[PDB]
Short mmCIF file of C-alpha atoms in Angstrom, two decimals:
data_model
loop_
_atom_site.label_atom_id
_atom_site.label_comp_id
_atom_site.label_asym_id
_atom_site.label_seq_id
_atom_site.Cartn_x
_atom_site.Cartn_y
_atom_site.Cartn_z
CA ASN A 1 49.82 72.35 -9.57
CA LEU A 2 50.83 75.93 -10.31
CA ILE A 3 50.73 76.81 -14.01
CA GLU A 4 51.83 80.46 -13.94
CA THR A 5 50.06 81.30 -17.20
CA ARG A 6 47.02 83.39 -18.14
CA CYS A 7 47.15 86.46 -15.89
CA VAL A 8 43.89 88.25 -15.07
CA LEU A 9 44.50 91.96 -15.79
CA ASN A 10 40.97 93.16 -14.97
CA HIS A 11 39.62 93.89 -11.47
CA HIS A 12 36.52 91.88 -10.53
CA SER A 13 33.11 93.15 -9.36
CA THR A 14 32.89 94.06 -5.67
CA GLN A 15 29.30 92.81 -5.73
CA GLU A 16 30.59 89.24 -5.60
CA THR A 17 32.20 89.72 -2.17
CA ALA A 18 29.16 91.58 -0.80
CA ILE A 19 27.67 89.83 2.22
CA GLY A 20 24.42 89.72 0.32
CA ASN A 21 25.74 87.51 -2.45
CA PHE A 22 27.98 85.55 -0.06
CA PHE A 23 24.92 84.55 1.98
CA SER A 24 22.45 84.06 -0.87
CA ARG A 25 21.42 80.94 -2.80
CA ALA A 26 19.01 78.32 -1.44
CA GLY A 27 20.58 75.37 0.36
CA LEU A 28 19.62 72.04 1.91
CA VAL A 29 19.39 72.43 5.70
CA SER A 30 17.39 69.32 6.51
CA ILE A 31 16.11 66.00 5.15
CA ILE A 32 13.13 64.33 6.82
CA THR A 33 11.84 60.87 5.98
CA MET A 34 8.47 59.49 7.00
CA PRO A 35 8.45 55.92 5.70
CA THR A 36 5.25 53.92 6.41
CA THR A 37 6.59 51.82 9.33
CA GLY A 38 9.96 50.93 10.82
CA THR A 39 11.52 52.82 13.73
CA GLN A 40 10.17 56.37 14.15
CA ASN A 41 7.11 56.48 11.87
CA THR A 42 4.28 54.43 13.39
CA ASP A 43 3.27 58.04 14.08
CA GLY A 44 2.88 59.93 10.82
CA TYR A 45 4.16 63.39 11.77
CA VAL A 46 7.47 65.24 12.25
CA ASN A 47 8.56 68.25 14.31
CA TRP A 48 11.63 69.94 12.89
CA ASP A 49 13.16 72.80 14.84
CA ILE A 50 14.41 75.31 12.33
CA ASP A 51 18.13 74.62 12.91
CA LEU A 52 20.83 76.46 10.96
CA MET A 53 23.89 74.95 12.61
CA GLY A 54 22.83 71.80 10.73
CA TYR A 55 25.49 71.72 7.99
CA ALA A 56 28.98 72.87 9.11
CA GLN A 57 29.53 74.51 5.72
CA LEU A 58 26.72 77.00 6.39
CA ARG A 59 27.57 77.27 10.06
CA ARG A 60 31.28 78.05 9.57
CA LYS A 61 30.21 80.79 7.17
CA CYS A 62 27.97 82.44 9.75
CA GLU A 63 30.35 82.03 12.71
CA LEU A 64 32.47 84.54 10.76
CA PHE A 65 30.22 87.09 12.48
CA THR A 66 28.98 87.61 16.01
CA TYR A 67 25.52 89.07 15.34
CA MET A 68 23.33 88.52 12.25
CA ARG A 69 19.83 89.58 11.19
CA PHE A 70 17.85 88.18 8.27
CA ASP A 71 14.68 86.94 6.62
CA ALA A 72 14.50 83.36 5.37
CA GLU A 73 12.73 81.59 2.56
CA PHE A 74 11.77 77.92 2.70
CA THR A 75 11.02 75.55 -0.15
CA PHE A 76 9.71 72.00 0.22
CA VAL A 77 10.81 69.34 -2.22
CA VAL A 78 8.82 66.16 -1.64
CA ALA A 79 8.74 62.79 -3.40
CA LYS A 80 8.81 59.17 -2.32
CA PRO A 81 12.16 57.68 -1.22
CA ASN A 82 12.80 56.72 -4.86
CA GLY A 83 11.93 59.98 -6.57
CA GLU A 84 8.34 59.10 -7.44
CA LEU A 85 5.49 61.49 -6.87
CA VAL A 86 1.99 60.39 -5.99
CA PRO A 87 -1.26 62.38 -5.43
CA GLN A 88 -0.82 62.57 -1.65
CA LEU A 89 -2.05 65.61 0.30
CA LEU A 90 0.43 67.17 2.73
CA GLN A 91 0.25 69.60 5.60
CA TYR A 92 3.18 71.69 6.89
CA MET A 93 2.34 73.66 10.05
CA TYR A 94 4.62 76.42 11.29
CA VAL A 95 4.89 76.28 15.08
CA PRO A 96 6.06 79.78 16.18
CA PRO A 97 8.49 80.12 19.12
CA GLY A 98 6.85 79.68 22.52
CA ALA A 99 4.02 77.78 20.94
CA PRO A 100 2.67 74.24 21.59
CA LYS A 101 4.19 71.57 19.31
CA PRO A 102 2.28 68.51 17.99
CA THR A 103 3.01 65.46 20.09
CA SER A 104 0.57 63.11 18.43
CA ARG A 105 -0.34 62.52 14.78
CA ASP A 106 -3.58 64.30 15.64
CA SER A 107 -2.79 66.66 18.54
CA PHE A 108 -5.15 69.63 18.70
CA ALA A 109 -1.85 71.39 17.97
CA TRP A 110 -2.57 70.83 14.27
CA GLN A 111 -5.85 72.79 14.39
CA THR A 112 -4.65 75.90 16.25
CA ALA A 113 -5.27 78.89 13.95
CA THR A 114 -2.26 80.85 15.23
CA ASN A 115 0.10 78.10 14.03
CA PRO A 116 0.00 78.91 10.27
CA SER A 117 -0.18 75.78 8.14
CA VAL A 118 0.29 75.32 4.42
CA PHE A 119 -1.50 72.70 2.36
CA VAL A 120 -0.20 71.23 -0.87
CA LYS A 121 -0.49 68.03 -2.94
CA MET A 122 2.64 65.99 -3.58
CA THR A 123 2.10 66.54 -7.31
CA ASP A 124 1.86 70.29 -6.77
CA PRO A 125 5.09 72.18 -7.47
CA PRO A 126 7.18 72.78 -4.29
CA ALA A 127 5.63 74.90 -1.52
CA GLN A 128 7.48 78.15 -0.74
CA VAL A 129 7.25 80.47 2.27
CA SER A 130 9.11 83.38 3.91
CA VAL A 131 9.66 83.40 7.69
CA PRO A 132 10.76 86.82 9.11
CA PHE A 133 13.13 87.84 11.91
CA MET A 134 11.47 86.12 14.82
CA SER A 135 14.12 87.08 17.38
CA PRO A 136 13.05 89.28 20.33
CA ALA A 137 16.48 90.93 20.27
CA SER A 138 17.65 93.27 17.50
CA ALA A 139 19.55 90.38 15.87
CA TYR A 140 20.47 86.70 16.09
CA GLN A 141 23.83 85.92 17.69
CA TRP A 142 25.98 82.82 17.21
CA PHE A 143 27.75 83.50 20.50
CA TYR A 144 26.55 84.41 23.99
CA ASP A 145 29.44 84.59 26.46
CA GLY A 146 26.94 84.54 29.30
CA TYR A 147 24.21 82.48 30.97
CA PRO A 148 20.41 82.67 30.45
CA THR A 149 19.53 82.17 34.13
CA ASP A 150 26.81 75.48 34.20
CA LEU A 151 25.08 73.35 31.52
CA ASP A 152 23.23 76.34 30.07
CA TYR A 153 26.39 78.31 29.29
CA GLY A 154 26.44 80.21 26.01
CA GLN A 155 22.87 79.18 25.17
CA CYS A 156 20.93 82.17 23.88
CA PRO A 157 17.16 81.45 23.62
CA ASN A 158 16.60 84.76 21.80
CA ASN A 159 17.62 82.85 18.66
CA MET A 160 14.78 80.25 18.61
CA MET A 161 13.36 80.46 15.05
CA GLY A 162 10.35 78.14 15.22
CA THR A 163 9.42 74.59 14.29
CA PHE A 164 7.95 72.91 11.21
CA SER A 165 5.32 70.24 11.71
CA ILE A 166 5.10 67.99 8.67
CA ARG A 167 2.62 65.14 8.18
CA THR A 168 0.13 63.70 5.70
CA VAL A 169 -3.49 64.85 5.81
CA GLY A 170 -6.27 62.39 6.55
CA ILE A 171 -7.64 60.52 9.53
CA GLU A 172 -5.89 57.34 8.37
CA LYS A 173 -2.16 56.93 7.84
CA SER A 174 -0.56 57.54 4.44
CA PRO A 175 0.12 54.41 2.34
CA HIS A 176 3.29 56.03 0.96
CA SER A 177 6.78 56.51 2.36
CA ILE A 178 7.92 60.11 2.07
CA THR A 179 11.24 61.90 2.14
CA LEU A 180 11.27 65.68 1.75
CA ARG A 181 14.27 67.96 1.33
CA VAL A 182 14.13 71.33 3.05
CA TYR A 183 15.86 74.24 1.37
CA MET A 184 16.48 77.56 3.05
CA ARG A 185 17.58 80.90 1.58
CA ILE A 186 18.56 83.94 3.61
CA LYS A 187 17.10 87.25 2.40
CA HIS A 188 18.00 90.78 3.58
CA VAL A 189 21.31 90.09 5.29
CA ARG A 190 23.16 92.33 7.75
CA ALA A 191 26.23 91.37 9.74
CA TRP A 192 28.17 93.02 12.53
CA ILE A 193 31.45 92.15 14.25
CA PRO A 194 33.65 89.86 12.09
CA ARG A 195 35.52 87.18 14.06
CA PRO A 196 38.33 84.59 13.33
CA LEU A 197 37.35 81.66 11.15
CA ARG A 198 37.00 78.12 12.49
CA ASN A 199 40.16 75.98 12.28
CA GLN A 200 39.22 72.95 14.37
CA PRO A 201 36.67 70.22 13.52
CA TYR A 202 33.24 71.00 14.96
CA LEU A 203 32.17 68.68 17.80
CA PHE A 204 28.82 70.08 18.97
CA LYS A 205 25.94 72.16 17.58
CA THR A 206 25.54 74.23 20.77
CA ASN A 207 29.17 75.10 21.51
CA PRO A 208 32.69 75.62 20.11
CA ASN A 209 34.32 72.63 21.79
CA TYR A 210 37.34 71.17 19.96
CA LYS A 211 39.34 67.93 20.32
CA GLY A 212 42.18 69.33 22.46
CA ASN A 213 44.10 66.04 22.10
CA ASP A 214 44.30 66.66 18.35
CA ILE A 215 44.77 70.34 17.57
CA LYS A 216 45.30 70.89 13.84
CA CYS A 217 47.60 73.53 12.32
CA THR A 218 45.77 76.13 10.21
CA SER A 219 48.34 75.76 7.38
CA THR A 220 50.16 72.70 6.00
CA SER A 221 53.76 72.09 7.01
CA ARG A 222 56.98 71.81 5.02
CA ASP A 223 60.56 70.64 5.59
CA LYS A 224 62.61 73.85 5.73
CA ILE A 225 61.61 77.53 5.93
CA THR A 226 63.36 77.83 2.57
CA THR A 227 62.23 74.73 0.69
CA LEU A 228 59.46 76.17 -1.47
CA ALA B 22 50.33 103.43 21.05
CA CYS B 23 52.62 104.43 23.92
CA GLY B 24 56.37 103.97 23.49
CA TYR B 25 59.85 105.45 23.93
CA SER B 26 60.31 109.18 23.16
CA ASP B 27 56.88 110.49 24.28
CA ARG B 28 56.33 113.25 26.87
CA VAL B 29 55.32 111.56 30.14
CA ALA B 30 51.87 112.60 31.39
CA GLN B 31 49.72 112.28 34.49
CA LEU B 32 46.06 111.47 33.80
CA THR B 33 43.84 112.00 36.84
CA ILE B 34 40.24 110.75 37.22
CA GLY B 35 38.37 111.03 40.50
CA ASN B 36 40.56 110.02 43.42
CA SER B 37 43.07 108.27 41.17
CA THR B 38 46.06 109.10 38.96
CA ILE B 39 48.33 107.10 36.64
CA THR B 40 51.67 108.30 35.26
CA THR B 41 51.19 107.22 31.66
CA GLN B 42 53.03 108.56 28.62
CA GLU B 43 50.97 110.68 26.22
CA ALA B 44 50.94 108.80 22.91
CA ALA B 45 48.27 109.89 20.41
CA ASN B 46 48.10 106.35 19.06
CA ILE B 47 44.99 104.93 20.71
CA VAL B 48 42.84 102.10 19.37
CA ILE B 49 39.18 102.98 18.88
CA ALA B 50 37.07 99.85 18.65
CA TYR B 51 35.03 99.47 15.48
CA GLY B 52 35.52 103.17 14.75
CA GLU B 53 33.11 104.22 17.49
CA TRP B 54 33.04 106.37 20.58
CA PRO B 55 31.34 105.33 23.87
CA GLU B 56 28.06 107.25 24.20
CA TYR B 57 24.78 107.42 26.14
CA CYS B 58 22.13 104.83 25.12
CA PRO B 59 19.44 105.96 22.57
CA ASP B 60 15.87 106.31 23.89
CA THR B 61 14.32 102.90 24.59
CA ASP B 62 10.83 102.55 26.10
CA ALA B 63 12.35 100.82 29.18
CA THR B 64 14.24 103.92 30.35
CA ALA B 65 11.22 106.15 29.57
CA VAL B 66 9.30 105.38 32.77
CA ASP B 67 12.56 104.42 34.49
CA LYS B 68 15.45 106.80 33.62
CA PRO B 69 18.97 105.25 33.56
CA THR B 70 21.29 105.59 36.57
CA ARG B 71 24.69 107.08 35.61
CA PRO B 72 26.97 107.02 38.68
CA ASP B 73 29.83 109.43 38.00
CA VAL B 74 30.76 109.12 41.67
CA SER B 75 33.36 106.42 42.39
CA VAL B 76 32.46 104.50 39.21
CA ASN B 77 34.17 106.88 36.77
CA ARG B 78 37.87 106.54 37.70
CA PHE B 79 40.96 104.44 37.03
CA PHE B 80 40.84 100.84 38.19
CA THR B 81 44.22 99.10 38.31
CA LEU B 82 44.25 95.32 38.26
CA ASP B 83 46.82 93.29 40.12
CA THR B 84 49.91 93.12 37.90
CA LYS B 85 50.77 89.85 36.19
CA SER B 86 54.27 88.41 35.93
CA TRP B 87 55.38 87.46 32.42
CA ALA B 88 57.86 84.59 32.20
CA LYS B 89 59.46 82.85 29.20
CA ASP B 90 56.74 80.19 29.23
CA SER B 91 53.58 82.27 29.96
CA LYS B 92 50.78 81.21 27.60
CA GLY B 93 48.55 84.22 27.87
CA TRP B 94 45.80 85.75 30.00
CA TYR B 95 42.23 87.01 29.57
CA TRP B 96 39.51 88.91 31.34
CA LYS B 97 35.77 89.03 31.02
CA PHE B 98 33.84 92.28 31.08
CA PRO B 99 31.95 93.40 33.00
CA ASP B 100 32.65 90.38 35.26
CA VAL B 101 36.19 91.64 36.08
CA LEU B 102 34.94 94.72 37.98
CA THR B 103 31.67 93.15 39.17
CA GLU B 104 33.47 92.36 42.41
CA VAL B 105 35.42 95.63 42.43
CA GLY B 106 34.41 98.90 44.06
CA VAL B 107 31.10 100.68 43.64
CA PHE B 108 31.28 99.39 40.07
CA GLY B 109 30.27 96.12 41.67
CA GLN B 110 27.46 96.94 44.10
CA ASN B 111 26.12 99.44 41.55
CA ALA B 112 26.13 96.91 38.69
CA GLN B 113 24.52 94.35 41.04
CA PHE B 114 21.75 96.24 42.82
CA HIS B 115 20.76 97.59 39.38
CA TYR B 116 19.18 94.96 37.11
CA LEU B 117 20.26 96.29 33.69
CA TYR B 118 23.74 97.57 32.78
CA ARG B 119 25.51 99.38 29.93
CA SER B 120 29.03 100.89 29.62
CA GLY B 121 31.97 101.48 27.28
CA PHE B 122 35.67 101.34 28.22
CA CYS B 123 39.13 102.89 28.16
CA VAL B 124 41.38 99.87 28.42
CA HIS B 125 45.06 100.45 29.08
CA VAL B 126 47.72 97.65 29.00
CA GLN B 127 51.32 98.31 30.05
CA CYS B 128 54.66 96.49 30.35
CA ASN B 129 57.77 97.52 32.27
CA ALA B 130 61.03 96.15 30.93
CA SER B 131 64.70 96.86 30.29
CA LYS B 132 66.09 97.63 26.84
CA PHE B 133 67.80 94.21 27.13
CA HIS B 134 64.52 92.30 27.17
CA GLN B 135 62.52 91.27 24.13
CA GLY B 136 58.98 90.05 23.57
CA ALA B 137 55.78 90.64 21.63
CA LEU B 138 52.32 90.91 23.14
CA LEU B 139 49.16 90.99 21.06
CA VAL B 140 46.26 92.81 22.80
CA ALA B 141 42.77 92.49 21.40
CA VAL B 142 39.14 92.60 22.44
CA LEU B 143 36.62 89.98 21.41
CA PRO B 144 32.85 90.42 21.69
CA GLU B 145 31.05 87.34 23.07
CA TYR B 146 34.16 85.35 23.91
CA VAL B 147 32.71 81.88 24.44
CA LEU B 148 35.16 79.08 25.27
CA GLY B 149 35.18 75.31 24.75
CA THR B 150 36.73 72.34 26.59
CA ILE B 151 38.92 69.53 25.21
CA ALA B 152 36.08 66.97 25.09
CA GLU B 153 32.29 64.40 25.01
CA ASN B 154 29.90 67.24 25.94
CA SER B 155 30.82 69.51 28.85
CA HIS B 156 30.37 73.27 29.04
CA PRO B 157 33.41 75.03 30.63
CA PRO B 158 33.43 75.75 34.40
CA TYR B 159 32.11 78.94 35.99
CA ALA B 160 35.56 79.84 37.32
CA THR B 161 37.14 79.98 33.84
CA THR B 162 34.05 81.31 31.99
CA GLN B 163 33.82 84.34 34.29
CA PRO B 164 37.32 84.65 35.97
CA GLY B 165 36.68 88.04 37.51
CA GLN B 166 39.53 90.33 38.55
CA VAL B 167 42.43 87.81 38.53
CA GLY B 168 41.63 86.63 35.01
CA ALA B 169 42.47 83.18 33.67
CA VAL B 170 45.42 81.75 31.79
CA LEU B 171 45.16 80.39 28.27
CA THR B 172 45.81 76.68 27.93
CA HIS B 173 45.83 76.41 24.13
CA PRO B 174 46.60 79.92 22.88
CA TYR B 175 47.03 78.67 19.29
CA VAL B 176 43.27 78.19 18.91
CA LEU B 177 42.45 80.72 21.63
CA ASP B 178 40.76 78.07 23.80
CA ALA B 179 37.86 78.35 21.33
CA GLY B 180 38.78 76.23 18.29
CA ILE B 181 39.61 79.43 16.37
CA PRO B 182 43.07 80.53 15.10
CA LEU B 183 45.05 83.14 17.02
CA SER B 184 46.71 83.81 13.68
CA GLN B 185 43.47 85.57 12.70
CA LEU B 186 42.59 87.56 15.86
CA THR B 187 43.75 90.83 14.34
CA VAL B 188 40.38 91.00 12.61
CA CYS B 189 39.47 92.53 15.95
CA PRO B 190 40.45 95.73 17.75
CA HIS B 191 43.98 94.66 18.54
CA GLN B 192 47.12 96.48 19.65
CA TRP B 193 50.69 95.22 19.56
CA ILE B 194 53.26 95.64 22.29
CA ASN B 195 56.81 95.15 20.97
CA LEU B 196 59.25 95.92 23.84
CA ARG B 197 61.78 96.88 21.16
CA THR B 198 59.58 99.95 20.55
CA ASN B 199 56.40 100.85 22.43
CA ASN B 200 55.59 99.23 25.79
CA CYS B 201 51.93 99.91 26.36
CA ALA B 202 48.57 99.81 24.53
CA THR B 203 45.20 101.64 24.75
CA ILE B 204 41.73 100.65 23.53
CA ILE B 205 38.41 102.50 23.39
CA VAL B 206 35.52 100.05 23.50
CA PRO B 207 31.89 100.99 22.68
CA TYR B 208 28.99 99.01 24.21
CA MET B 209 28.06 96.03 22.01
CA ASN B 210 24.86 94.01 22.37
CA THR B 211 21.59 92.99 20.66
CA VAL B 212 19.71 95.11 23.20
CA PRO B 213 20.55 98.50 24.84
CA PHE B 214 20.67 97.14 28.41
CA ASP B 215 21.65 93.58 29.32
CA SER B 216 22.40 91.74 32.58
CA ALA B 217 25.58 92.84 34.35
CA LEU B 218 26.00 89.43 35.96
CA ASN B 219 24.82 86.80 33.46
CA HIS B 220 26.24 88.06 30.18
CA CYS B 221 29.82 89.23 29.42
CA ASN B 222 29.73 91.54 26.37
CA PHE B 223 33.36 90.83 25.49
CA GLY B 224 36.69 89.42 26.56
CA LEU B 225 40.13 91.02 26.79
CA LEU B 226 43.13 89.03 25.60
CA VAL B 227 46.87 89.61 26.19
CA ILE B 228 48.81 86.94 24.32
CA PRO B 229 52.58 86.74 23.86
CA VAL B 230 52.99 85.91 20.17
CA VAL B 231 56.75 86.29 20.50
CA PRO B 232 57.90 84.75 23.80
CA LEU B 233 59.76 86.76 26.43
CA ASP B 234 63.55 86.49 26.16
CA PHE B 235 66.51 87.81 28.10
CA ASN B 236 69.91 86.61 29.26
CA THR B 237 69.77 85.11 32.75
CA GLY B 238 70.81 87.65 35.35
CA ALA B 239 68.17 90.14 34.17
CA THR B 240 64.71 90.33 35.79
CA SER B 241 63.04 87.02 34.85
CA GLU B 242 59.46 88.25 35.13
CA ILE B 243 58.07 91.24 33.26
CA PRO B 244 55.10 93.02 34.82
CA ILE B 245 51.93 93.53 32.80
CA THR B 246 49.69 96.07 34.51
CA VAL B 247 46.18 96.72 33.22
CA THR B 248 44.12 99.80 34.04
CA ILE B 249 40.42 100.05 33.25
CA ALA B 250 38.21 103.12 32.91
CA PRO B 251 34.42 102.97 32.34
CA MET B 252 33.01 105.41 29.83
CA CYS B 253 29.39 106.59 29.97
CA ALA B 254 28.29 103.76 32.25
CA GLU B 255 24.53 103.65 32.93
CA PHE B 256 22.37 101.32 34.99
CA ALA B 257 18.63 100.64 34.95
CA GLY B 258 16.95 99.92 38.28
CA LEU B 259 13.34 99.45 37.12
CA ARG B 260 11.79 100.65 40.42
CA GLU C 10 60.33 120.63 51.77
CA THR C 11 62.67 118.82 54.13
CA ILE C 12 63.64 115.18 54.52
CA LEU C 13 61.22 112.75 56.15
CA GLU C 14 62.85 109.97 58.17
CA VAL C 15 60.46 107.26 57.00
CA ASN C 16 63.11 104.62 57.58
CA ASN C 17 63.22 105.33 61.33
CA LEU C 18 64.23 101.87 62.49
CA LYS C 19 65.68 101.15 65.92
CA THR C 20 68.26 99.25 63.91
CA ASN C 21 69.11 102.58 62.19
CA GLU C 22 70.16 104.70 65.18
CA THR C 23 73.88 103.79 64.87
CA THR C 24 73.97 104.43 61.09
CA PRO C 25 71.42 107.36 61.04
CA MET C 26 72.14 108.41 57.46
CA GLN C 27 70.22 105.28 56.48
CA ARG C 28 67.05 106.80 57.97
CA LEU C 29 66.77 109.44 55.22
CA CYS C 30 65.82 106.90 52.57
CA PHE C 31 64.25 103.45 52.35
CA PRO C 32 64.85 100.54 49.89
CA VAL C 33 63.06 98.64 47.15
CA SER C 34 64.38 95.44 45.57
CA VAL C 35 63.48 92.72 43.11
CA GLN C 36 62.99 90.21 45.92
CA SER C 37 59.80 92.05 46.78
CA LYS C 38 56.84 90.44 45.04
CA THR C 39 54.19 92.45 43.18
CA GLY C 40 51.48 93.80 45.49
CA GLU C 41 53.48 93.69 48.69
CA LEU C 42 53.58 96.68 51.02
CA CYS C 43 56.76 98.75 50.89
CA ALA C 44 56.10 101.24 53.67
CA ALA C 45 53.60 103.26 55.65
CA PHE C 46 53.39 106.24 58.04
CA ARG C 47 50.71 108.71 59.05
CA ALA C 48 50.74 112.43 58.25
CA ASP C 49 51.33 113.49 61.87
CA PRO C 50 53.77 116.45 61.53
CA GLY C 51 53.61 117.65 65.12
CA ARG C 52 53.77 114.06 66.42
CA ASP C 53 56.67 111.69 67.10
CA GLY C 54 57.97 109.74 64.15
CA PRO C 55 59.37 110.35 60.65
CA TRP C 56 58.31 113.99 60.52
CA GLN C 57 60.52 115.01 63.45
#
């Protein structure tokens, strides 16, 4: 509707609009499930590449800028598929960029001291960690108009943020099915170069391809330029 | 920037001159002036090469004809000049590259013509196909001198509204008034020196928001000449 | 300064006035050559 009543006669706080508060708040970026046995769990481990272009809502927000630098905070919510918590010991290993990722439920990859791991019981309150600005360049960039050497067009490897190796501790397999929600919160934000906002459904994580057969108009349509 | 009622000038740089009208209405990208790269350990044991020879002059690109149905054009930097003059062999034989730009856009039309051209610069101008997966070709991703034509100017061939491109260093050309634009562009990267061949720091767009109109019998194609001038262009050899 | 006969065409000898100037038209496409001549004052050609 449009109830033209109750007019706000007081200016609002500029803090609200500040990039800091715009890109604050923890948010779900990934959901991993390690049930006992079915399709992809006769293993007992998971390798999750820290991916931000996971949920379009977050992504479209970032894409508003060309280059962005920031620290991140991760929190691990874990419980069985039905919300129940059991006394199961877990291990989350952080595999830094350009570092060997577990391939087996017991790869030596899990013992490497340089790959920092965090231990926590399922009953323990959520595990929290802060992962810095791993990029080799002065800032992350959502766009790279060049080539890093074509199928590898626009791919910038200077953005790789690392991987998270989850799994249950113990020689044997875990008797429980797990499903953990990964929350991420950007700290210390800085953005440069503001660009036009997305106006076409996203079709790929790596590029800005759009369904050219169906190009949608940014604003709804009406009958006449005067019907209002 | 440049329009009717402005004292005609003659800017000369090197072995080249352009008769452009002096109009103190130039666009200065992100409020910055093109300067000489701040000390970085790489150019500490390998000082940067700054050819002021035949690299600092006025490059004029082959004019483009503007017809009632033209959809737009675009150029990638530094790709555009990579094949042109010493700016090419210099940018090629030298690994790293870094430079700012004086970008001049200019129409030539009668006072009986009408049209509106938006002229903006866009850092990291990645493009996307119509799709299934398929990264754009190499001929449209890095068009070079000739440039490439826009196919879907409404989303800028990148799934993003044209309606919002003014959030970038833009400049309007409204035949009814001015007839030429000018833009100062400072080097923009995530590192002081990048690769002059692989990466294109930004793209130049010339889109006709308001189509070109005239009454038949008048020149049917309006020229759009673009002149480029490098500012404080350095190169790292690493040898 | 004096007039250069850049339009010195054999076809011009009967209507010489034409040799004092040369033409430009719309028909010409962008980037096409209009004219040329060397700076040879003392030598046969336009400068005479």
